[PDB]
Design a protein around this nucleic acid. Sequence first.
DNA 1: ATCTGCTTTGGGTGGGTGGGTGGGTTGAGGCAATT
DNA 2: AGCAGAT
Lengths: 189, 618, 174, 595, 196
Amino acid sequence: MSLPAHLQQTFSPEEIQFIVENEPIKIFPRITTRQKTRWQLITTDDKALNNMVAMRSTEVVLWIALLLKQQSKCSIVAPQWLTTKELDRKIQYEKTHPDRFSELPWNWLVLARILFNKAKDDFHDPIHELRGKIQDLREIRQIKVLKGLKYLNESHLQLDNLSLLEINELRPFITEIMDKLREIHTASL
Amino acid sequence: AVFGDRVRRFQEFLDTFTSYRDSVRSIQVYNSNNNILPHRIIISLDDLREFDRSFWSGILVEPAYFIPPAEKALTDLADSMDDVPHPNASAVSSRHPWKLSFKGSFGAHALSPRTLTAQHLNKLVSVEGIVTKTSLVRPKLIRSVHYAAKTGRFHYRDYTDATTTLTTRIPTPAIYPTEDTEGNKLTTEYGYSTFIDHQRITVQEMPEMAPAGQLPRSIDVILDDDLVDKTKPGDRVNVVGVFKSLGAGGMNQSNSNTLIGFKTLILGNTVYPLARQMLTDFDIRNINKLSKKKDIFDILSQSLAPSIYGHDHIKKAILLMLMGGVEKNLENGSHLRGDINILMVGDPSTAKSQLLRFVLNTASLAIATTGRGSSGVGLTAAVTTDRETGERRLEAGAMVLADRGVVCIDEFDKMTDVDRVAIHEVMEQQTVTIAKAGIHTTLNARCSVIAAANPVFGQYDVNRDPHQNIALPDSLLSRFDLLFVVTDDINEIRDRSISEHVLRTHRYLPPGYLEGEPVRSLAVGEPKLVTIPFLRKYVQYAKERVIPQLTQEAINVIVKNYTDLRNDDNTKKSPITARTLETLIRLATAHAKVRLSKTVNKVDAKVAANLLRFALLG
Amino acid sequence: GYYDIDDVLADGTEFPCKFQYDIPGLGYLENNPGRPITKNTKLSLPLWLARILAIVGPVPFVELLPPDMFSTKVMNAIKTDPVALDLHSINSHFFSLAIKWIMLFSEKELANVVSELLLQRAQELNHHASSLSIDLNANIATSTFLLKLEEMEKEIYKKSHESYKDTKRWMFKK
Amino acid sequence: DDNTEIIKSFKNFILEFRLDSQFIYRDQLRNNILVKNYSLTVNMEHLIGYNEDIYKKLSDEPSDIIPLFETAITQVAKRISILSLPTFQLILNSNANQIPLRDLDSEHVSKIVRLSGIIISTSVLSSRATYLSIMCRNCRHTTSITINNFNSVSLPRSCLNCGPDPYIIIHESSKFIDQQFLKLQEIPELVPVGEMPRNLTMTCDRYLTNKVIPGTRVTIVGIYSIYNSVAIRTPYIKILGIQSDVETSSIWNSVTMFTEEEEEEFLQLSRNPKLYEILTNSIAPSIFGNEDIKKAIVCLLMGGSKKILPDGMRLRGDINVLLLGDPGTAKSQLLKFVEKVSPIAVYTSGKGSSAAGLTASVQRDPMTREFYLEGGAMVLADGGVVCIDEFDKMRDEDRVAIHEAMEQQTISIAKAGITTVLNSRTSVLAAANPIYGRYDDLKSPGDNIDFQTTILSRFDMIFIVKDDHNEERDISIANHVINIHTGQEENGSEISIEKMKRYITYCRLKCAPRLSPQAAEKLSSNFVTIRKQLLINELESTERSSIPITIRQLEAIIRITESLAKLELSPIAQERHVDEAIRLFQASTMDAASQ
Amino acid sequence: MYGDLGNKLVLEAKRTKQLYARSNQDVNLPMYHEDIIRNILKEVSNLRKNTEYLKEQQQLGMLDDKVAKCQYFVTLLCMERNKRCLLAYQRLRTDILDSMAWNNNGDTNNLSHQEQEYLKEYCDLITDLKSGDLVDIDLSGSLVPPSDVFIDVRVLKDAGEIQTEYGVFNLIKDSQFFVRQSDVERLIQQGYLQKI
DNA sequence: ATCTGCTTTGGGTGGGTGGGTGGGTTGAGGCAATT
DNA sequence: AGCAGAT
Ligand SMILES: Nc1ncnc2c1ncn2[C@@H]1O[C@H](COP(=O)(O)OP(=O)(O)OP(=O)(O)O)[C@@H](O)[C@H]1O
Ligand SMILES: Nc1ncnc2c1ncn2[C@@H]1O[C@H](COP(=O)(O)OP(=O)(O)OP(=O)(O)O)[C@@H](O)[C@H]1O
Ligand SMILES: [Mg+2]
Ligand SMILES: [Mg+2]
Ligand SMILES: [Zn+2]
């Protein structure tokens, strides 16, 4: 009908990327738009863009930042959680707590993929090391998800600190299996 | 430590379920009254799973560490039950512990000889297949008891082997002790020693279940004590046991190969046949009610091979052959056979082979052979050597294996004279005489032969006499009760009918499948057409508990028919003889069997006469 | 659902039944047409007919006998090893008929058995759906397990496999 | 010392190897552990790219480093799947030049080699030890041993007084793996001048077992080594990888080995409106004319559909074709092509064959003195096609030994105690000559054919190919053959042998059409007319027809209809296929009978 | 029995759904099963005749209450089952037609005349919806989020100098453009352009 | 006088660079000569 | 286990 069958009840990875690209990020303008034309937006705030000064930290929407970076007119400042040391700490936290997920942002995978693809010269650590660390973290969280899937039931379930992309991956299996369990239980009464 | 705990846990299981206790008590009572039941108990794995999951999982995955405790617990229970006042010295010295046997549902351990791999070693498995070999039963020493005359006390010694127990122990050579610890002379007391029987069989994968272009595989099995002679070659069995490995497997420096694996085999716990149907009171009453019908013969005959058009009389003959006659042996020595042999000769594509295959599938026991695929030795028996003991013996052939059953011979005319002689002897005498390799014996082969042959020129010729049309000897021909000559005569109505029937048959779709889907257990213990299973039950019942006797009226009918038949101008496709009288009596007796009657009446004689007349004079 | 094709197919399976009255002119239910159907007759009717005949009729018109798909043997096989069991052969719409049966008779033993079977099977279902092949230059187990899946499990597996495949394609898109 | 460093190096390859943005081996390992396949297939071109030094070690001493790369894989697998598992198998892929089977000699001992051949025999699986638990006879001291299957191991000779060899294995605590033996014969073309083909013994482990069947061409990567059975050693190859063009696993079990992407191609090809023409043109592109025989060969390759009735009767689903004709007709070339296109096929000459050579033969093992059964041509071709050339030279007995296997598709044996009924579901494609070499029209048809009616009725379609001297056709054939001699369409009018073979496999394992009522009525009317036509022809001539028309021909027409339907993945066979089937039957068997 | 034809029709509907799911881009509705539907409706007609005969017999006949109830119940249930199967098949086909109508901006021999009329007036409805207050949005637009502003595209099939709303594009076969995705999104949808 | 060490039966848990004039002997299948 | 050899 109006909506394809693969977009029903769930989001596509491109939809998740679209959602992620509206969060603010920090950039270093390579131009001085501030006056001592003008941006006119309706979906976000435009004061920051109208007030830019060379080599001065400022915050804008992620998609505008990517558009500016495409023109070599801004250098994205990578988040603080995306350094080598922070990823080692998160890996250690995951290793020592088999029964819980680490406190990574809800967009760590998507943002990592976007920034590695687009801004390769804006990180202060070698890119290969960061890719390896993210891969390790993904494997640990996958083990934890596999172990936690054994507690599906006709009642609620809790998956704290699970990120958006992982939840999107698992939404069909979890929802349908739990729905069938609920249907059986309800038929029982 | 753990062993005692497990024995306690199994003892608590036997307490919770009282059926096993009742069975043990009944076995002991029956033994006391007395021929003798063995000390074996069948436990349901499902009940054990319901009771204690850990014990069930251990018995399925680590039987070595969990079966001996259960056997000991059962033996302790039985001993606590025993109340025999005076135990005989043999009984006191006897080493006869209670053995455990399993049933129920094996989830993923239900396998076949092809699917057994190294991953399944040291686990309880159930295997299905055909028994192809069977060694000779030889006693095996377990315990020896001696007597010291001077000291006046008995001693004993315990022996163990790799195949007599599930846990590895130090080997014990079978040398009997001769001197006491202090140097006294010891005399063995054989009457108080303990020996058990021992046999090894080979189970082969079912040929029809094999992959494409691969010959079936087999596995070796060991049966001890009361499981020794529960199977014979050619039987379909389901064997439960523990998959093991033996020997050093080339790890000893004597063998320099360095590329040979370990030996493997199964120690059986149970054997389950897959041949006789168990009749219920409902089945018996239904059989009787049907037999009271006046057209039961026609219904049963038509029910045979519903997918073959026509051939009513051949189907009737096949029914009478499945029922058989009555075997009589006289005091003087004459031994009259009660089996019916049938020969079909006709043009190509007349459904002879399909009738043979249907008889193969329906009959309780049936062996398949062809003309060019068989041999004289392969039909009677072969001389081989026993691997276990290295002793000369005989292996039964197709005719011997089919004793008290049926043997279907396809392409009877493509055999050789040397191979035809064996069948001639078997049909003439119903026995097999063997004189080879210093062996003299007489094997029993009491089977019914149903065969199909082609004329000499590949198509029956009406002009030429029957002798010129068939290449088989007259002596061999006289041994067939009914000779059916079937011709493919082109006709319009008949062709339309047969073509419509074939087209209808070719459009069948089995339930559980979609259109265009090409065609491809759960437990081990466990004018309307009559279904094949009910036909088998009817045949079993009738040929098991009916022995009709002749009566003067049937006698008059038979004598009149024989007299008229022999001296009649009309030519016969086969020559009348005194053997025709025996065939008439046999057919009448078989038809009486069909009706579940104790006497042969006029109707049976009139049916036999009509069948023989159709066979002889079309 | 009324328009759900799988449900329409499921409602068409045959269940054993036993009539309890004497109804002339109902032969077509039996093989023969145009003959009276005597009482205590045993015959297999489609679910959409048998259910309504069983609830409508005091003594209803028919009584539902235990189907061979919910027998003791099948339950024991389910409990022993759920993953290895071949559900497709027992019935291609096993779970739907099971839910309908539970609702009809409100029996909880079957409910618990079926729930445990479904959970244990779903574990392996996700194990297989999560496994995505790779091409180095530029299997058997997965196929044998797929052959055994029931229709509803086959839909769930397809959906999960497509979701995993889409996420992997997006993440490693050059 | 060095072993730990080598293990560390191979562990860093599995954790650091990325060609773009995907870790190929880390992800391959996780995906394999999830489906219970404890192995990793590594391409040696990737290892030569990470660090050439690691390849130098793996190639200089293969049986010492391969065991240290397996333990690295196991450690990485534990790190990836277990949040704090037997030793993992390593399967290798290489593109190095293939050494001919007969060129392997002392210069290649203990080296990685690649070679091709034909598998002629496979053994029953054995069990090799991987972890022994041992005990001492006297002092009862418990110990364990660990074994890798790479030979250059035995129980300790001295205990840890205790006499020599004091240790006995405790079996209920040991673990074993699977081992298989294979015989590899060299390809017929590679063989040197005037030499018999040579064999070579091979062994595979764990996940490389039950991967091949006798008679299939394979490519092998392994180690050419030696084992002592005086100062000579018998060579053998330790398999490290198997690659084959035949999906034997799909053929024995279900449908497998077809990717969804590969499966999509087959559906697209089936949707082609004129797939029949493409397949007909794709058979023997180098043989001119003979379109009807090529359509018959397409139908034979496709096969019908087999039915098992409730009462137990089985209906044959294969099609048998006979080619009778004059010399130079290209019957042998058609047979040699069909042997090469079919997934399973055997080419045999009726003269150089025997009753036991076909079917199965009884053989005695010289060691055990026990008779066993070995399959012949019809068993080796099970599930495929047998091409019996020179069908007229076969002896009467050897030909009679084929009736049951051709009709009932089973080989009943009763010899030397062995009593069984094997399975042989094969299609026979036979070529023969008339009595006088050329079909002489002057004499009656009963004089040109020495085959009996029984054997002939078993053939679905009989082609009596006659060579007529026509100037136009002769010029056309001359031009075609000269073009062949002096001289690639692949534009939707022809598909290569590989694609056609894969499509045959897919169709056979995916479709089994059924007749609709209209087709049944049509075929039934046609059978009545054909039988009447034989009777009118017979009444005219005293002689009894030499080519028969029995119920088997009706079943053959049904099989041809079903094969034509299956060709296009149509679950139902309609009249549009019945008409073609009737046309082919009239073009071959009624044509032969009319003369 | 009395629902075998409906079961066969629903099986064909299932096959149609499976084909639609498997197919990647090109979907063609199988030929409308006119024959099976004709047979089903004929069967419903005989069932109606049976109900009328039963009522007539009850009005003047020896029939009893229980027997009449049972037969009148078994006939009604059969009619209901046939109706359900028919409606399920038709609804599946209509859903695929809706999907096709939305995929285009707004062969046919397979469809029955009723389905042809349905599709025509449904496209009319879609265009009417597009004409309303949602004009600024291209309701039958692309459902993939916009990611890149400028894309490289290649002309897949030769055509004249098509004059789109956004401008003039000289669609020469085998020629590349550096343009904004928003402008050439329709041409990509039709197949005149490819993203590469 | 004591300690150290090899090899059977006969059989494939020694083999075919030890052979069959050192014994393990029927069954099947192919080939020449006889027909 | 009996017999063949080295300390
Ligand atoms: N009366 C019949 N009804 C149905 N099928 C028949 C009939 N007669 C022959 N056939 C068909 O004949 C086919 C093969 O013939 P069959 O093998 O039964 O003949 P046969 O008498 O053993 O021939 P031959 O002399 O070649 O050994 C079977 O598929 C069966 O379908
Ligand atoms: N279109 C063709 N028709 C006939 N022969 C051809 C054709 N193309 C090539 N040939 C030649 O046919 C020869 C092969 O012989 P062919 O297969 O025709 O013999 P046959 O008739 O089957 O056998 P025989 O002569 O023993 O009866 C090869 O030399 C090949 O070059
Ligand atoms: Mg036959
Ligand atoms: Mg030739
Ligand atoms: Zn010791």
